[PDB]
Amino acid sequence: SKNRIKVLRAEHNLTQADLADKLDVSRQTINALETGKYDPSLPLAFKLARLFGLRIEDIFQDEG
Amino acid sequence: GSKNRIKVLRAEHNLTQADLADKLDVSRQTINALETGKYDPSLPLAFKLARLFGLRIEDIFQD
Amino acid sequence: SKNRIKVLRAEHNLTQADLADKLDVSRQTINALETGKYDPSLPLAFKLARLFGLRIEDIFQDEG
C-alpha cells in the first residue's frame, strides 16, 4: 500500500512530468501514484518496473 | 571522445552497457565505443543520451 | 535535422563562406546543415556552439 516512485524519480533525475511523458501517462497520474490516490493498473506497474530496471515488487509493496 | 561521463552516469542510474544500449536503440558495442571514445556520437544520439539522463549535452560530453 | 544556423548567420551578417571559413568546413558542408540535409557529428555541433557563444541545445532542435 505504498511505493518508491518519488524516491526513484529523484535518483534518475526525473520530474513528475518527465516520468509521465516516458510512460505515456499524464503528470496527474504520476502524482496520483506517488500520493497513493490511484493504484496503478498492472500494465502501468510493468512499465514503471522496466523503466527503472527493477521488478514490480522492488517498487511497490502491498499487504496480503 | 574519451572524456565523457557515460560510464559514471550509468553507475548512478542502475544501467549496464546493454541496458543503456537498449534504452537508446543502439547496440552494446556502440555504447562501449562511446564510453571509451572510440566512436563520437551523432548529434541525434547525443540528444537521446542527454534526454535519458536529464542533462545538457555539455554535461555528458567534453569536446 | 532542424537548427537555427541560418537565422544566426542573418543575425550576425555572415555568409555561408564566412561561417565555413570561421569553422574550417567547406561551404557545401554549411549548406547541408542549414537545409537539414546532414545531421552533424557532435564535434561539429560543439564548434558551432562555441563560435556563436551558445549551447548546443540553443542552436539545434531534435525530436529525440
CB contact under 8 A, B44 and C55: no
Interface of A with B in 3-42 (CB under 8 A): 11-14, 18
CB contact under 8 A, B57 and C56: yes
Task: List the resolution, Å.
Answer: 1.6
Cα–Cα dist A59/A48, whole Å: 8
Write out the H or E segment, with its range, that includes residue C49.
Answer: helix C42-52
At the second CATH level, the architecture of A2-58 is Orthogonal Bundle (1.10)
B29 backbone φψ class: left, alpha, beta (φ>0; ψ -120 to 50): alpha
Per the CB < 8 A criterion, the answer to whether A14 and A48 are in contact is: no
In this structure, whether the domain defined by C2-55 belongs to CATH 1.10.260.40 is answered with yes
Per the CB < 8 A criterion, the answer to whether A41 and A35 are in contact is: no
Q: B51: distance to nearest CA of chain C, Å?
A: 8
Which chain B residues are within 8 Å of A18, Cβ to Cβ?
54
Which chain B residues are within 8 Å of C42, Cβ to Cβ?
40-43, 46, 57, 61
Nearest CA in chain A to B55: A13
Taking alpha carbons only, the member of C6, C13, C10 closest to residue C36 is C6
In eight-state DSSP terms, residue C2 is: E
Q: Please give the CATH superfamily to which domain B6-56 belongs.
A: lambda repressor-like DNA-binding domains (1.10.260.40)
Smallest Cβ distance to C39: which of B44, B61, B63? B44
